[PDB]
């Protein structure tokens, strides 16, 4: 399937400009590295109006600027031959949605400061090798798929493996594959079985369940090996990952009332508009969670508009409930 891009334009802190998701295929026009989300979509951050050209857009869309559970994920992005201008294979790792490892020039490269300083150069040399074997193995699985779906040309193959440690200490793990951005194969480590929603995917399911020693191995890695890696990195990034920075709330009007919150970490946050003094469920925009560029984050909530009514902005970060009074007669 193809997903039309969502666009938002905003500044790093109130007066750097950010053009910031949810799109597929990866074809899109400083710029950050290509990133992947849990739903197989991609997201980019371009920082200094904004023009975005995509396959789901006939005319290019224009937007102007006018004013605690921890996880470890690993993504693979495959691109059927030829290159189409994009690297055919890209693998990227994430802990708490923080970029760490980045392979495409075939090198094992860190994306964080605490990643490289805590790891000896032998570590990167060993995994840059693994990745080359993984790149080639991914290409072969791609060709095999195109022959199974009986079509050629541009197609994307995606892999996501990861685990997460709950605040209480409970753990889960997952392995999923996606063809052209749609869920393809889903692995359940409890029953050691693959789930297929497609007649074509069912073929690979019968091949992948035919190998028990692979299935048994995948259970171990998620449950045991992954978590150990997770906790190793957390101790490494104890500085940046365990910090808490408070949001700075700004309110504005243009009818519509805007509520901005700048530079807060962790990304877990809740914002809603209030009227005497209840939360308004109507004529409201979510805004989502956006990257600031500092490693911090910012979001926004708007409401379109009797007399003497009090409109105020509720924000809970550290909880720590914050309220700002925006408007009244």
């Amino acid at each position, epitope marked *: 399937i193809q997903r039309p891009p969502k666009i938002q334009v905003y500044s790093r802190h109130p007066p750097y400009l950010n053009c910031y998701y949810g799109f597929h295929p990866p074809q899109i026009e400083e710029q950050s590295d290509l990133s992947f989300s849990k739903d197989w979509s991609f997201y980019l951050l371009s920082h200094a109006s904004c023009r975005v050209k995509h396959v789901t857009l006939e005319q290019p869309r224009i937007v102007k600027w006018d004013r605690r559970t921890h996880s470890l994920r690993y993504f693979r992005l495959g691109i059927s031959e030829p290159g189409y201008g994009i690297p055919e294979f890209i693998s990227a790792g994430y802990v708490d949605s923080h970029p760490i490892t980045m392979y495409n020039s075939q090198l094992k490269e860190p994306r964080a400061l605490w990643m490289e300083e805590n790891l000896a150069p032998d*570590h990167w*040399e*060993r*995994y840059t*090798q*693994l990745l*080359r*074997g*993984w*790149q*080639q*193995a991914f290409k072969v699985e791609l060709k095999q798929l195109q022959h199974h779906y009986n079509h050629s040309g541009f197609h994307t193959y995606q892999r996501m493996i990861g685990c997460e440690l709950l605040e209480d200490g409970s753990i889960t793990g997952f392995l999923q594959y996606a063809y052209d951005g749609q869920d393809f194969l889903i692995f359940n480590k409890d029953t050691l079985s693959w789930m297929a929603m497609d007649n074509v995917a069912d073929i690979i399911r019968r091949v992948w369940e035919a190998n028990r*020693h*692979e299935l*048994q*191995y995948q*259970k*171990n*890695w998620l449950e*045991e*090996e992954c978590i*150990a890696w997770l906790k190793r990195f957390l101790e490494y990034g104890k500085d940046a990952l365990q910090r808490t920075e408070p949001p700075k709330v700004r309110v504005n009007h243009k009818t519509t009332l805007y509520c901005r919150a700048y530079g807060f970490y962790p990304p877990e946050i809740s914002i809603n508009w209030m009227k005497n003094g209840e939360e308004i469920f109507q004529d409201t925009d979510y805004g989502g969670i956006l990257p600031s560029g500092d490693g911090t984050y910012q979001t926004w909530v708007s409401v379109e508009l009797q007399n003497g009514d009090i409109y105020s902005c509720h924000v809970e970060h550290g909880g720590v409930h914050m309220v700002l009074q925006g408007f009244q007669e």
Partner: antibody
Amino acid sequence: NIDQPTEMTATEGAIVQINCTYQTSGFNGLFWYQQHAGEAPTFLSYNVLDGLEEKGRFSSFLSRSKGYSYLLLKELQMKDSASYLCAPLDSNYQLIWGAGTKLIIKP
Amino acid sequence: AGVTQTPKFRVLKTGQSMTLLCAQDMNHEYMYWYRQDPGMGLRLIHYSVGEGTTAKGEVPDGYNVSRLKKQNFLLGLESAAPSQTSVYFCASSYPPDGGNTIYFGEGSWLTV
């Protein structure tokens, strides 16, 4: 580091057990290999989860916590006389080979 | 199919340059070369992840390695030493993302 007996000796038709103790950084699996005298090593068993694995007369057990694994050979024949190599799969995917247990089958 | 390793025997005077072939009909990425000695487990001289790319293994002073095709993996020692007497094994397998068994070559005996 990895440790297994240097040599063992049993009579044909009996049942033998070869122990293997290993300490590695992580654990990605454990392989048992059979290498006859003056020949190439061949695959026997592979274990990851804690438990047993039976294939024919041969059976393999593994305990991840203890770092222990034994290889259970039942109904020993004369062709069973060889070296049995234990090697686990580490954390990074390098493979660490220990010097096998040489089994000598008496008729 | 299988993995083929030539030769199986060789006698060398010290200082001789000689090469050892290894070939897979099996269509794998990975290729290994090993050196087995008495009382010691296998020791990896060099490994090749994919065609054209190789890397130093556990013990490789004497040995320089190249990868022609996906099918061929060459070993070489340009200057022979008495300490290089051993029983070499070539070996090709799928990547260790597992459990992926490793397939072994019939071996090469060497003295010196």
